[PDB]
Design a protein around this ligand. Structure first.
Ligand SMILES: C[C@H]1OC(c2cccc(O)c2O)=N[C@@H]1C(=O)NCCCN(CCCNC(=O)c1cccc(O)c1O)C(=O)[C@H]1N=C(c2cccc(O)c2O)O[C@@H]1C
Ligand SMILES: [Fe+3]
Length: 296
């Protein structure tokens, strides 16, 4: 395990990490879940704009004494200095991105930049494993999860056809649909779901996103999949989608195959991925469900 080592950042820049990181500070709440997943020594993390940690890993973060820092958008440099980190992690795109603050952060400690929007949680874990010297941990974690998804894939009786994954906000608002490279789409694909891709031409406005295509509301009526999964929703919450009169003729609504992906499914990390797969076992597997549900 060689140190120093060079890390390739998502913007084409490089960062030399002089020594194995032991005090990692995350500036992106999305990335923190994956740092926890590989048991990296993350000692502090910024939060959502609402000053929260994601619920799938909050209790674990508290147990490991991960200090909650600023809500996304407002980097507190004093807090970074006081934590005395030896690696600072930044995301490329998303509400939790501190990309423009990199020069200020790099003055404090080696700062790296990753894009979680177009890779699986496993790929992000591998990338972070290489930055932290935790390749053994990451590889083991990924391998174990993949052994599990194999087993699950073999017992699910999924609806015929394909599924889409939607972030729903109702009429008169820009909504969003998961793209093939998203952590969400790839997670479902891994247990045998066949994914519908939103038409790239439906992009709303000028901002490019690799995770979910942002679209005018009306385009939701054009989705063809027989099944719809809603992020950040329970099944009960998904009822609002099902009863939206504008969407009454959607194949997934006609077949009453609209499901919540789960309360904690907004971002995908090992912890929310487990919850999501557990939900699929409960709904689509028989008395084979329980033999495979993972303890949280
Ligand atoms: C539990 C909460 O933590 C965050 C969160 C945490 C960390 C990073 C994020 O991005 C986060 O959203 N999300 C929840 C929250 O604040 N809910 C209140 C509504 C926020 N909303 C409006 C609703 C439409 N968005 C989607 O349907 C959607 C779908 C799929 C993926 C997404 O990221 C989506 O937001 C947003 O658009 C928010 N994201 C941008 C943003 C800005 C610049 C570049 C981007 O890529 C952006 O997303 O700006 C807002 C703050
Ligand atoms: Fe967002």
């Amino acid at each position: 395990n060689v140190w120093p080592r060079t890390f390739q950042n998502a913007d084409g820049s490089i960062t030399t990490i002089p020594s194995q990181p032991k005090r990692i500070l995350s500036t992106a709440v999305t990335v923190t879940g994956t740092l926890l997943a590989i048991d990296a020594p993350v000692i502090a993390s910024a939060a959502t704009t609402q000053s929260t940690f994601f619920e799938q890993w909050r209790k674990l973060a508290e147990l490991r004494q991960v200090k909650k820092l600023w809500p996304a958008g407002s980097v507190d440099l004093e807090s970074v200095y006081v934590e005395q980190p030896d690696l600072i992690v930044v995301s490329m795109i998303g509400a939790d991105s501190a990309r423009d603050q990199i020069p200020l952060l790099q003055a404090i400690a080696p700062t790296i930049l990753v894009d979680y929007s177009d890779q699986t949680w496993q790929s992000l874990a591998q990338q972070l494993g290489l930055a932290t010297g935790l390749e053994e941990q990451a590889e083991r974690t990924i391998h174990n999860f993949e052994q599990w998804t194999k087993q699950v894939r073999d017992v699910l009786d999924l609806p015929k056809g394909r599924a889409n994954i939607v972030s729903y906000h109702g009429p008169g608002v820009v909504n969003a649909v998961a793209k093939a490279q998203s952590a969400h789409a790839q997670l479902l694909q891994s247990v045998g779901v066949v994914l519908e891709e939103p038409d790239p031409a439906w992009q709303a406005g000028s901002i490019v996103h690799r995770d979910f295509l942002r679209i005018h509301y009306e385009h939701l009526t054009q989705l063809q999949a027989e099944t719809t999964f809603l992020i950040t929703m329970t099944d009960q919450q998904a009822q609002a989608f099902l009863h939206d009169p504008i969407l009454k003729n959607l194949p997934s609504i006609q077949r009453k195959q609209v499901y919540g992906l789960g309360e904690n499914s907004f971002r995908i990390d090992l912890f929310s991925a487990r919850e999501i797969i557990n939900s699929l076992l409960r709904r689509f597997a028989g008395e084979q469900a329980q033999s495979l549900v993972m303890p949280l």
